[PDB]
Design a protein around this ligand. Structure first.
Ligand SMILES: Cc1cc2nc3c(=O)[nH]c(=O)nc-3n(C[C@H](O)[C@H](O)[C@H](O)COP(=O)(O)OP(=O)(O)OC[C@H]3O[C@@H](n4cnc5c(N)ncnc54)[C@H](O)[C@@H]3O)c2cc1C
Length: 410
């Protein structure tokens, strides 16, 4: 177990291998600048500083510049011997550029593509020459829609922040069961900042699906910052069309009361044993239940929800299964969504790969949590389950806004 030259540097991804889907599921879609080095190499030790300064510049939160879709990574040839032999690394340092043969386009479904690479002619580049050469290589080798840009920026911020945690803790787990308003807001924020940016507002069906959803969030959940979003949605004209850049600006400016920052969203209820687990998906369920519970009028909540998931949700498999749900008009939406979710819980009960080992899926609510709706001896009582859900998901606008503790800088 060698630390290498980057162990404290959250801007650089340490690679043990060639398969970028093990880094992250979106990684194969994005360009990589890779430093092969040896941790005992003085020249490499000296250059790692330059490489690290450069990587630090791949942290812009909303980039205009296509350089920003790149991410820096490194392979320590002292640890990964087979990998370096595979690339014929003899002398170090060496810079390689990696990129997908074909680029994913906005509303196409990105598939697996062939991993391509380009050895740099000169591996001694200064920071500025590094940016120029990486930008050039990205432009030459890739077609980047705004959606793909968002895809990759989001992906490397997940890694920066996950590694920074490991670094911070380099100086036991218990699930947080209580519902926190801020998770619902994080979900709303991530829905607007990420999911909508990927697909845009076209065609008219999709734009309608989004308008209904945002309109619903605003009227269901006051003081969650949906006002600004509504305004942004209204500002779109054939004259001033949707752009990811202006959309994300308005979204950030809406003042949604999520914890964390636009590129690092803090989950509480939805925090997992590792940051790759739970988070946004867990957040979305919460937002959806809260809407069923807090919805005004005869409002079509289940219909609105399903239209949104259909045109918006960034989980392919999730989107496909949720559309298969036939929601009856009769039964209470709170109960229908509740059954749907537990249905998904059941399917997912035993999955190993991809799952948080320390957060089982159960049938919800559990005995402990609710003994009043969970009674009837050996079965489930759907009488109190409503009361429990309408209690637990009830939205109190003064819950979110209120002093938070600064020591949560930790
Ligand atoms: C619409 C939708 C469809 C999805 N489809 C898939 C899919 O097809 N395949 C897949 O692998 N993943 C799917 N997911 C993601 C997956 O369901 C989980 O969100 C994810 O695996 C993480 O689960 P979790 O352990 O954090 O709890 P989650 O399943 O995300 O639940 C989040 C929180 O909601 C509360 N909750 C749990 N059950 C209920 C309930 N029955 N009623 C009300 N509240 C409840 C709990 O507090 C829980 O912590 C989907 C998510 C959504 C929102």
């Amino acid at each position: 177990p060698r630390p290498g030259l980057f162990h404290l540097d959250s801007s650089v991804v340490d690679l043990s291998g060639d398969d970028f889907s093990r880094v992250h599921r979106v990684a194969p879609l994005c360009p990589w600048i890779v430093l092969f080095y040896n941790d005992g190499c003085g020249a490499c030790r000296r250059y790692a500083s330059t490489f690290s300064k450069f990587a630090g510049g791949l942290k812009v939160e909303h980039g205009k510049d296509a350089l920003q879709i790149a991410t820096a990574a490194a392979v320590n040839c002292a640890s990964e011997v087979d990998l370096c032999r595979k690339y014929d690394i003899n002398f170090v340092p060496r810079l390689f550029f990696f990129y997908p043969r074909d680029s994913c386009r906005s509303n196409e479904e990105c598939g697996t593509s062939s991993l391509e690479h380009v050895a740099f002619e000169n591996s001694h580049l200064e920071v500025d020459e590094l940016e120029s050469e990486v930008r050039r290589l990205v432009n030459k080798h890739m077609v980047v829609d705004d959606s793909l840009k968002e895809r990759c920026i989001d992906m490397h911020f997940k890694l920066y922040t996950s590694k920074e945690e490991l670094v911070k803790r380099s100086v036991r787990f218990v699930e947080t069961t209580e519902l926190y308003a801020t998770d619902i807001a994080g979900a709303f924020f991530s829905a607007m900042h990420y999911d909508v940016s990927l697909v845009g507002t076209e065609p008219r069906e999709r734009l309608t699906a989004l308008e209904d959803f945002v309109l619903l969030v605003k009227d269901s959940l006051p003081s969650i910052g949906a006002d600004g979003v509504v305004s942004a949605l209204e500002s779109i004209t054939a004259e001033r069309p949707f752009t990811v850049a202006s959309w994300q600006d308005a979204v950030v400016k809406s003042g949604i009361p999520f914890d964390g920052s636009p590129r690092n969203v803090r989950w509480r209820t939805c925090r997992g044993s590792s940051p790759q687990y739970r988070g946004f998906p867990c957040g979305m369920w919460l937002l959806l239940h809260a809407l069923t519970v807090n919805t005004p009028a005869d409002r079509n909540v289940l219909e609105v929800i399903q239209n949104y998931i259909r045109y918006f949700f960034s989980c392919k498999e999730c989107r496909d299964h949720f559309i298969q749900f036939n929601f009856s008009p009769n039964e209470d939406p709170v109960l229908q969504l509740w059954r749907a979710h537990n249905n998904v819980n059941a399917r997912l009960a035993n999955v190993k790969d991809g799952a948080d080992p320390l957060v089982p899926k159960r049938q919800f609510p559990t005995l402990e949590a609710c003994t009043e709706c969970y009674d009837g001896a050996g079965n489930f009582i759907e009488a109190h389950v409503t009361g429990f859900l309408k209690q637990r998901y009830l939205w109190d606008p003064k819950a979110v806004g209120l002093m938070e503790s600064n020591d949560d800088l930790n």
